[PDB]
């Protein structure tokens, strides 16, 4: 219990550090697609509103 309860929190901070450093590099590089795909989709919604 209290052994993992701590680590679980710590772990998530890791998993997060893992995942986001990965993608943010890709994003910087022009891969990963989520970063040019979604801002499109919300910009196009914003357009559709206007």
């Amino acid at each position: 219990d209290p052994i993992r309860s701590f680590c679980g929190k710590l772990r998530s901070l890791a998993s997060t550090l893992d995942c986001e450093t990965a993608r943010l590099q890709r994003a910087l590089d022009g891969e990963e697609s989520d970063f040019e795909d979604y801002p499109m989709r919300i910009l196009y919604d914003l357009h559709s509103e206007v």
């Binding site: 710590l10 901070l13 550090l17 943010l24 970063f35 040019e36 910009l43 196009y44 206007v50």
Partner: protein, 86 residues
């Protein structure tokens, strides 16, 4: 609060702050976004002129609305004087 939590927030801030400076780069460089951004920006200029037209059209509507009423006192005045004859 805790030293742990305070760290996380330090991280999310760095993470989030990148993501923002990321979208700033994307939207200001990548062409497909940059058009849809100008297309909105242009369509703001027109939807702005459409306001000025709606502003004047509201005004002449007003000006007409009173002229209709000052017309209305006139034909409602002389209905009273023929009705006294009849």
């Amino acid at each position: 609060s805790s030293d742990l939590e305070q760290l996380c927030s330090h991280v999310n801030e760095k993470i989030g702050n990148i993501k923002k400076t990321l979208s700033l780069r994307n939207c200001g460089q990548e062409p497909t976004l940059k058009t849809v951004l100008n297309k909105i920006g242009d369509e703001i200029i027109v939807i702005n002129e459409l306001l000025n037209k709606l502003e004047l059209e509201i005004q002449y509507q007003e000006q007409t609305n009173n002229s209709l009423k000052e017309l209305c006192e006139s034909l409602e005045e002389d209905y009273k004087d023929i009705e006294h004859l009849k």
